[PDB]
Design a binder for this molecule. Structure first.
Ligand code: ZN
Ligand code: ZN
Ligand code: ZN
Ligand code: ZN
Ligand code: ZN
Ligand code: ZN
Ligand code: ZN
Ligand code: ZN
Lengths: 79, 79, 79, 79
């Protein structure tokens, strides 16, 4: 990555490892080690992501925002 | 929100995203992005909430308190 | 409690809420709100407890120790 | 251990307790209390490990790295 990983990884149903980092990013990583995508946030992602029934990744950041991100990496919504 | 989200989101059985923030609040957010309710606490909510069989949300805060909150947003009890 | 709750609560199979606090303690709390027991540790319990198949509560502390605690509150072992 | 345990323990399917520590290590501990193995990292392991279907332990560290570790203790990959 590019920042310390204080976030705890969540594992998708397809096996994808979802984790945040204090480099302002959220990383989706395949089990083989290659990166699926990364979603840039406005602050350090200290929160551990959560996965719902639809596969949406819910993670908070140090920019007052709670990000909802689709499995493909596009932003669903943000609070 | 109004504060950095160091808390990790818990996802309800109905799909509701439960998360805390260091703005002293606990947020219940629908999957569509709209807010269900928020419960104000006496300190920054750094702990990640937990959900039991009855749907009660258990989360700790930086005010020495462990809050138990019903799914509708009213306080069950606090330790 | 007596200290800020940075630990995230784990919920037992009987419904018991297991959480730590930075007052050096680990708290087991019944869903009704009354306390089951508390196990004193040598440092602030910042880690979130985990529960295994036998009901043992595994939680780390800021005293270099990883505590294993039986459901009744007595120490199983510590690393 | 040799450092404060800010990481939250993950419990394997065989019962093994996987946890990190700020002594730069990741600890795999049998339920009897004896250590299975430890994997040294380049920074304090503040993240809580996660376990996938294959039993791989995914944990982040304060050295910008996301470690993937096989159940036997050898490194799968790292990001
Ligand atoms: Zn760094
Ligand atoms: Zn930053
Ligand atoms: Zn801020
Ligand atoms: Zn405050
Ligand atoms: Zn205090
Ligand atoms: Zn202390
Ligand atoms: Zn120390
Ligand atoms: Zn160090």
């Amino acid at each position: 990555t590019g920042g310390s990983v204080h976030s705890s990884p969540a594992i998708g149903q397809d096996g994808t490892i979802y984790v945040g980092s204090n480099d302002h990013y959220l990383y989706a990583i395949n089990p083989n080690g290659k990166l699926k995508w990364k979603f840039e946030t406005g602050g350090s992602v200290h929160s551990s992501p959560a996965i719902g029934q639809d596969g949406t990744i819910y993670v908070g950041s140090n920019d007052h925002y709670l990000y909802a991100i689709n499995p493909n990496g596009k932003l669903k919504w943000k609070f």
